[PDB]
Amino acid sequence: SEVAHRFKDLGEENFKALVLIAFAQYLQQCPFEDHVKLVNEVTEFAKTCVADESAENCDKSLHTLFGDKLCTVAADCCAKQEPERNECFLQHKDDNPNLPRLVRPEVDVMCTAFHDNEETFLKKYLYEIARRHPYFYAPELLFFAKRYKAAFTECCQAADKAACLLPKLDELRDEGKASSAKQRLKCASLQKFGERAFKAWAVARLSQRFPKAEFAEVSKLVTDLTKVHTECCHGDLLECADDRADLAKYICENQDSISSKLKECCEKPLLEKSHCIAEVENDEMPADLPSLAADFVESKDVCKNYAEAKDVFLGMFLYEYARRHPDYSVVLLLRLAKTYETTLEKCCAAADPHECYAKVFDEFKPLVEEPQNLIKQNCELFEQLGEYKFQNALLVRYTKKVPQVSTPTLVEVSRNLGKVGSKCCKHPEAKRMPCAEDYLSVVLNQLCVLHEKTPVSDRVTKCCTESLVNRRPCFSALEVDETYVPKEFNAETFTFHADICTLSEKERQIKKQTALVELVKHKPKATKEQLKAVMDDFAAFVEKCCKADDKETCFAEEGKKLVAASQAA
Numbered sequence: 001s002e003v004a005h006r007f008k009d010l011g012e013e014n015f016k017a018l019v020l021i022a023f024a025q026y027l028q029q030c031p032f033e034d035h036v037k038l039v040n041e042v043t044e045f046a047k048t049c050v051a052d053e054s055a056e057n058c059d060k061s062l063h064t065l066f067g068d069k070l071c072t073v074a075a076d077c078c079a080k081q082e083p084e085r086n087e088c089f090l091q092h093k094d095d096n097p098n099l100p101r102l103v104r105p106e107v108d109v110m111c112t113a114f115h116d117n118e119e120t121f122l123k124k125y126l127y128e129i130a131r132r133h134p135y136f137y138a139p140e141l142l143f144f145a146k147r148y149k150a151a152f153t154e155c156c157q158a159a160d161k162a163a164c165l166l167p168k169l170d171e172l173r174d175e176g177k178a179s180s181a182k183q184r185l186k187c188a189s190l191q192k193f194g195e196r197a198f199k200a201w202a203v204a205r206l207s208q209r210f211p212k213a214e215f216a217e218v219s220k221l222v223t224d225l226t227k228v229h230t231e232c233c234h235g236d237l238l239e240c241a242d243d244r245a246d247l248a249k250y251i252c253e254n255q256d257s258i259s260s261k262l263k264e265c266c267e268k269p270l271l272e273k274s275h276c277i278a279e280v281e282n283d284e285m286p287a288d289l290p291s292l293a294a295d296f297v298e299s300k301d302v303c304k305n306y307a308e309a310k311d312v313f314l315g316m317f318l319y320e321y322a323r324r325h326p327d328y329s330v331v332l333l334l335r336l337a338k339t340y341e342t343t344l345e346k347c348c349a350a351a352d353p354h355e356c357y358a359k360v361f362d363e364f365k366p367l368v369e370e371p372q373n374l375i376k377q378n379c380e381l382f383e384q385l386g387e388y389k390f391q392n393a394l395l396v397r398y399t400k401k402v403p404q405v406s407t408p409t410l411v412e413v414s415r416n417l418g419k420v421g422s423k424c425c426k427h428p429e430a431k432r433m434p435c436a437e438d439y440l441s442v443v444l445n446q447l448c449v450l451h452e453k454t455p456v457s458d459r460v461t462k463c464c465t466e467s468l469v470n471r472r473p474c475f476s477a478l479e480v481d482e483t484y485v486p487k488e489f490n491a492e493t494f495t496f497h498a499d500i501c502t503l504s505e506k507e508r509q510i511k512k513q514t515a516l517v518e519l520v521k522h523k524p525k526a527t528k529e530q531l532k533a534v535m536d537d538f539a540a541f542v543e544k545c546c547k548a549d550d551k552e553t554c555f556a557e558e559g560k561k562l563v564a565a566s567q568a569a
């Protein structure tokens with residue numbers, strides 16, 4: 001009995017939570033009630049299996065049971081069987097479900113609902129998140145949950161809750177989005193590029209983190225870790241949760257052989273331990289490490305070793321190079337690893353290999369500088385424009401690159417691209433690259449997945465499937481779409497009403513930003529000079545209308561003077 005197995009392992013509290021998440025993530029439209037209903041029914045069934053490990057259908061696989069249970073509330077998918085049925089669902093998850101924005105009632109109402117029924121108050125939380133982020137790292141979602149409970153449990157019994165909860169709640173919403181994003185990259189990697197790619201990323205990323213660990217140790221870690229995520233990303237939430245626990249345990253027992261900063265982590269509860277380990281800082285770099293050139297360019301056995309086990313060899317190369325370069329971004333390490341491979345491949349076929357692959361490191365110099373120069377520039381610019389304006393600059397720049405993309409997606413992607421500035425730039429040269437380019441991999445992955453739902457630009461398609469690690473270079477390379485045909489104005493699109501006044505300060509810029517896009521799609525060839533001169537104008541249109549007697553018509557009048565002058569520039 002599989003259900004029973006996992007149950008004993010996770011216990012009832014986690015088993016129930018993990019199953020509610022799986023249901024919310026599969027059928028994101030169905031109400032809270034129905035999932036709560038199916039979860040209970042299923043959990044009860046599990047209880048009868050722990051006892052009689054041969055009762056009803058305790059023999060069957062998790063998918064079958066889970067599949068049949070949802071199929072009692074859904075159709076084509078449920079028409080299929082075992083494998084096809086499950087893949088079906090996986091292919092229907094929606095990365096941008098059309099759900100109602102989620103608004104939070106007054107502090108008073110939340111504390112009452114929380115104190116009254118606690119289990120419910122949290123289950124609903126899990127439900128609203130798992131349905132909006134169908135790829136949220138399941139185990140980690142339970143961690144946030146405990147943190148969300150501690151927030152209320154503490155703030156609801158204080159002097160000023162609004163002051164105590166609201167903040168902690170914001171910190172959580174953001175980090176929850178961050179978390180969702182990274183995990184979406186891992187799944188995208190695994191699903192669109194294979195496990196080979198995911199492994200490569202794991203090696204470099206972990207070798208940087210555990211410089212002292214041995215190659216055969218990291219290799220072990222990477223193998224398990226791969227499994228964990230392979231499972232979560234495919235929907236096998238229970239086992240993912242289990243395996244992840246195992247991996248946390250192991251890493252803790254064997255600290256000494258892995259890292260010296262894992263102390264703090266292993267002295268805490270499960271959910272907090274796991275989260276702690278995955279985010280630990282890089283251990284100090286071992287003192288006397290030889291030069292790479294020795295065993296990788298100078299040696300005369302290279303090609304031989306490469307031919308014997310190309311995988312273990314390149315893997316070792318990556319580990320070696322990463323471990324001594326925590327200043328390099330994971331994607332940069334992989335680019336290098338890829339250049340070395342292409343070199344051996346052609347060089348090992350020549351007359352005198354040694355001579356051909358002798359100057360490989362000169363190939364590396366250009367690749368290492370490209371990122372450094374780009375980071376240096378854009379942060380210089382960030383420092384001078386500030387976040388909002390910088391976001392607007394990235395807005396104009398990306399709309400000229402891929403004009404077909406939907407205004408909503410452009411606005412979202414460009415806004416996030418701007419945040420990178422604020423997160424990284426403040427770091428010293430030494431840690432800028434990992435921060436900057438790894439974040440950029442996440443944000444552009446967002447653009448890719450949203451776009452794959454409804455492909456309108458071949459340029460985005462090419463850049464998203466050609467290479468995972470070169471996505472950024474691909475995009476930076478693009479300048480302006482020379483074949484794009486300018487759109488034709490629409491009154492409705494540029495009609496500013498008074499309803500923009502009730503909207504928060506942010507919801508405003510967001511409006512002015514959506515207008516900036518619409519304009520660019522209209523005058524691709526326009527210039528940054530003109531655009532600015534026009535933007536500032538829109539600012540005026542809001543201050544006036546919004547504060548000028550009973551005017552819901554100002555929007556049409558002041559708006560007329562707007563489009564008039566707009567059509568002019």
Ligand SMILES: CN(C)c1cccc2c(S(=O)(=O)N(C)CC(=O)O)cccc12
Binds near residue numbers: 375424440476477
């Ligand atoms: C760290 N941060 C300031 C950044 C460094 C390098 C490139 C960045 C980019 S970007 O998309 O690569 N970009 C502006 C380069 C380009 O469009 O060719 C966006 C946002 C922040 C960036």
